[PDB]
Structures are given as structure tokens and as C-alpha cells.
Design a protein around this ligand. Structure first.
Ligand SMILES: CC[C@@H](Oc1cccc(CN(CCCOc2ccc(OC)cc2)c2nc3ccccc3o2)c1)C(=O)O
Length: 268
């Protein structure tokens, strides 16, 4: 009569497979190289071609269309909004999460979503670029670096994180538990029921530790490596939020979707 941690790990993995449109298996199939192959965006010509096919409404305004960098900024936010919806549904599978007060659920998701986004973003990145638009585009790392400041500073730190994160060779069963652990941080600002959240965190981290022990017997330090990656993600989000605020304040055409402005409001 004890918790079945192996069953819980499988439940979390199944909830991740059901709730996230993108995962590492799907991304790798596309990145390896028959139907709906990804359009390569490596310069302004190919960006504009891709937009006309994949986000036609955004470029149907003629001389009124926004600057390319601002269009990219908007597209990035759209993915974040959708991923927040997926993360919110995923969180229901985490033991104890749905039993928390609604306000604590909101706070955990507020601080956790971008850490989870950047962790999962790594699955669609290689050293040369990243998948976009539900796997239907591939935008090169060099093209994103070529954008005018400060838009060229958005993605590069996330590539830097991803190259090292991907070198750990996690699979989706690992990532699902890592995302659940990200969401269950008992030290987020403003939590009410810290005690219950700490116990929820302890439980999911126990599931993660045992899973990594079983799934990665070759890497005895993988668990502390991932604890450090969680801290790295918190710093990456803090810096990202600062950049988003600079853009919002100084780029009169770069707007922030209201759901994301609420996430960012009073975060760091
Ligand atoms: C800028 C403010 C914005 O920052 C960022 C910064 C980095 C990443 C994101 C979200 N993101 C990139 C989507 C790009 O989406 C397009 C689509 C079309 C296009 O042109 C045709 C160009 C880019 C993404 N997260 C994922 C999670 C898992 C799997 C894949 C994922 O991808 C937002 C924020 O803070 O929300």
C-alpha cells in the first residue's frame, strides 16, 4: 500500500502526449527530412513567402502590414498563448494541482509557463534553426540573428540553452516530468498554501528522480543536472521578460497579447 511512482510517471507522460501539439518525437521526424514538408525561412524573401502561405491574414494589409520584425514578434506570441492553454490542461494531471486553491494554480502557472515553454522549445531546435508554425516552417538561427535590434536578441539565448539541454538526450517521458516539476515550484512569489505546494513538488520530484534513474542509468548525475537546468530557465525567463518590456515600451508597433501581458505583469 504505497504510491506507484512508475504508474504516475506514465500518467504524466500520457497527459503530455495528449495535451501538447508538439513533442520531441514529432519534431525529430520533421527535422530528419514526405507530406507537408517544412518551408525553410532563411531570408526576407522566404519569410514573406512563408507568411503568405502559413499566416496569410497577417500580411493581407498591403502598405499597412507591420515591419517584418514585428510580424515575427507577433507570431512568437501566438505560439506562447496556445502553449499556455496546453500547459494549463496538462497541469490537471499533476497529483495535487487541481486540489489547490484557484489563485495558487494561477500563480504556479504564471511563473512556470515560460520556463516550460523554453524547455519544450528546445525539442524543436537544432544548431541551425527551429521549427515554427506547427512544424510547417523551419526558421534559421542566422536569419533570426540578422533581425534589427532588439528583435535579434529574442531567440539566440534560447538556442544557447537548447544546445546544452539537448545534449542531455532526454526523451518525451523525461521532458513530461521535467515540465511537471517546473510547474510545482513552492517558492514562487505570492503563494498562499506553500506547505501543500511543497509536498506536491516533493512528490513530483520524487517521480522524476526515480524515472531518470531507470531511464538514464548511464548518467548518474542527470537529476542534479536537471535541477540546475530549472534554475537556468528561471534566469532565462527573467532576462526574457526584461527584453519583452523594452520592446513593448520602445516599439510602438509591437503589441503584447493581453493574456501574456497578464502573465508578465508583476512577474519579475
Ligand atoms: C517574442 C515574445 C515571445 O517570445 C518567445 C521567445 C521564444 C519562443 C516563443 C514561443 N515559441 C516560438 C514560436 C515562434 O513562432 C513563429 C511562427 C511563424 C513565424 O513566421 C512564419 C515565426 C515564429 C515556441 N514555443 C514553443 C514551445 C514548444 C515547441 C515549439 C515552440 O515555439 C516566444 C513571448 O514571450 O511570448
Amino acid at each position: 500500500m504505497t504510491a506507484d511512482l512508475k504508474s504516475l510517471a506514465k500518467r504524466i507522460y500520457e497527459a503530455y502526449l495528449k495535451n501538447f501539439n508538439m513533442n520531441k518525437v514529432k519534431a525529430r521526424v520533421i527535422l530528419s527530412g514526405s507530406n507537408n514538408p517544412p518551408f525553410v525561412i532563411h531570408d526576407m524573401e522566404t519569410l514573406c513567402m512563408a507568411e503568405k502561405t502559413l499566416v496569410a491574414k497577417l500580411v493581407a494589409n498591403g502598405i499597412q502590414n507591420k515591419e517584418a520584425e514585428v510580424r515575427i514578434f507577433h507570431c512568437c506570441q501566438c505560439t506562447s498563448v496556445e502553449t499556455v492553454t496546453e500547459l494549463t490542461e496538462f497541469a490537471k494531471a499533476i497529483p495535487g494541482f487541481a486540489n489547490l486553491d484557484l489563485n495558487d494554480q494561477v500563480t504556479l502557472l504564471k511563473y512556470g509557463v515560460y520556463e516550460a515553454i523554453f524547455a519544450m522549445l528546445s525539442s524543436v531546435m537544432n544548431k541551425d534553426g527551429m521549427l515554427v508554425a506547427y512544424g510547417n516552417g523551419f526558421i534559421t538561427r542566422e536569419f533570426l540573428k540578422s533581425l534589427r535590434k532588439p528583435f535579434c536578441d529574442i531567440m539566440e539565448p534560447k538556442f544557447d540553452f537548447a544546445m546544452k539541454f539537448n545534449a542531455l538526450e532526454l526523451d518525451d517521458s523525461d521532458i513530461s516530468l521535467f515540465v511537471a516539476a517546473i510547474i510545482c515550484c513552492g517558492d514562487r512569489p505570492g503563494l498562499l498554501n506553500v506547505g501543500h505546494i511543497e509536498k506536491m513538488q516533493e512528490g513530483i520530484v520524487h517521480v522524476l528522480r526515480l524515472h531518470l534513474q531507470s531511464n538514464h542509468p548511464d548518467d548518474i548525475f542527470l537529476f542534479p543536472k536537471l535541477l540546475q537546468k530549472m534554475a537556468d530557465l528561471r534566469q532565462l525567463v527573467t532576462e526574457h521578460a526584461q527584453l519583452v518590456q523594452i520592446i513593448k515600451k520602445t516599439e510602438s508597433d509591437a503589441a503584447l497579447h493581453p493574456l501574456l501581458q497578464e502573465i508578465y505583469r508583476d512577474m519579475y
